[PDB]
Design a protein around this ligand. Structure first.
Ligand SMILES: [Co+2]
Lengths: 214, 222
């Protein structure tokens, strides 16, 4: 079967800038190449077909070209709403095969997180566990250090972080960090602090609460 | 023009499942139909195709599904189906139904092939408070913890609330059970008149849960 080799795997672009994605077929596929856009949480959307025709309703910034083995797809002036993974696909002969995808990250101006902290709920505590959640909202770039401190003692090995996809409008990320401990350990300590270090903060920001405060 | 997949779910390796896709707003009998699947690890993979009455409904299959999967259609019901036998772990993914030219796609239907038993989540409030308030905005949310397998879906006030929502990718805990948070930022003035409810659905365990998230005062009045 025909291998479609799609490059780059990742692309960092400022809005207004150009995106060029390439697919190379392990053998000739004439012009039976299509390009798809898949935004987070959505199904693929057809953008370009027979390698160079743009589908109905797709804006002019989207082009493609190529024949045989070498195919490219272009977004001339990338918009925040173009945040997606893009895929090529070979229609020429079965099995129809897809490129591995290209993930677009949109470069923007630095934006500091707003930081929020959440104590464990009364209901969860009843069950023997304490989850403490720190939220970093609407920031850029993704790079961020979140440090948990309990009674000013730095934590290690007992937290996990999750990050959202870039927002289609403001191009920011949000991030959750969840500190997990036993109810017994939780009740042994007073101060629960999340400390955030980020390029957009002139100095790390700490949000905290006392066990029993809320 | 619309397609809708159903039939997906959780199944044991070696098990069987049938997916369905119903079309409307086009002349179905005129279109070749495809099933395509997607997983993070493997990406997009074409699975099966069925052609027209003319062809005597010619079918083709990806090597990896040959002898196990059968595509069929019912033109009189504008429907295409995928019968899946002897399911493998690697058949896990979201399955999409798409016509020739892949002009349009459905919402997809999730197949999970796993020997593990299911576990429904607990849903805990992330209460809004002074600790999650900045400049007249408050953040609140819900922690959906200790479930297996993926996915859960989270909505707010039955989908009436979408602005400012961030539902985070689940993370695998050291226990092997998933956890995720969904948050939203809202006017802090809203807290007094608006009820905030996270609607949680983990279909594998038949969990359908609505959790009202109530504000906490802490010592803000002091
Ligand atoms: Co007080």
């Amino acid at each position: 079967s025909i291998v479609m080799t799609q490059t780059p795997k990742f692309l960092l672009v400022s809005a207004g800038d150009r995106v060029t994605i390439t697919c190379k077929a392990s053998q000739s596929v004439s012009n039976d190449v299509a390009w798809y856009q898949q935004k987070p949480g959505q199904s693929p959307k057809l953008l370009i077909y027979y390698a160079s025709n743009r589908y109905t309703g797709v804006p002019d910034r989207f082009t493609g070209s190529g024949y045989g083995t070498d195919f490219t797809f272009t977004i001339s002036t990338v918009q925040a709403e173009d945040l997606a993974v893009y895929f090529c696909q070979q229609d020429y002969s079965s099995p129809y095969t897809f490129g591995g995808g290209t993930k677009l990250e949109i470069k923007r101006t630095v934006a500091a997180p707003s930081v929020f902290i959440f104590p464990p709920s009364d209901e969860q505590l009843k069950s023997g566990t304490a989850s403490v959640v720190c939220l970093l909202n609407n920031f850029y770039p993704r790079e961020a250090k979140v440090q948990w401190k309990v009674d000013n003692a730095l934590q290690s090995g007992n937290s996990q972080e999750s990050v959202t996809e870039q927002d289609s409008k403001d191009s920011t990320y949000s991030l959750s960090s969840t500190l997990t401990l036993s109810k017994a350990d939780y009740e042994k300590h007073k101060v629960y602090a999340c400390e955030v270090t980020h390029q957009g903060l002139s100095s790390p920001v700490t949000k905290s609460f006392n066990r029993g405060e809320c | 023009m619309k397609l809708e997949e159903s039939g997906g779910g959780l199944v044991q390796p070696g098990g069987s499942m049938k997916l369905s896709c119903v079309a409307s707003g086009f002349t179905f009998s005129n279109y070749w139909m495809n099933w395509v699947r997607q997983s993070p690890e493997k990406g997009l993979e074409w699975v099966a195709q069925i052609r027209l009455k003319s062809y005597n409904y010619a079918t083709h299959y990806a090597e990896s599904v040959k002898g196990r999967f059968t595509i069929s259609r019912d033109d009189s019901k504008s429907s295409v189906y995928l019968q899946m036998n002897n399911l493998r772990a690697e058949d896990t993914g979201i399955y999409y139904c798409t016509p020739d030219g892949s002009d349009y796609w459905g919402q997809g239907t999730t197949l999970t092939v796993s020997s593990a038993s299911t576990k429904g989540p607990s849903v805990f409030p992330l209460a809004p408070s002074s600790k999650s308030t900045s400049g007249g905005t408050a953040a609140l949310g819900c922690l959906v913890k200790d479930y297996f397998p993926e996915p859960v879906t989270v909505s707010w006030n039955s989908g009436a609330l979408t602005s400012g929502v961030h539902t985070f990718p689940a993370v695998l805990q050291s226990s092997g059970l998933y956890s995720l948070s969904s948050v939203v930022t809202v006017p802090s003035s809203s807290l007094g008149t608006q009820t905030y409810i996270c609607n949680v659905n983990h279909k594998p365990s038949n969990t359908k849960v609505d959790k009202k998230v109530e504000p906490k005062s802490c010592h803000h009045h002091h």
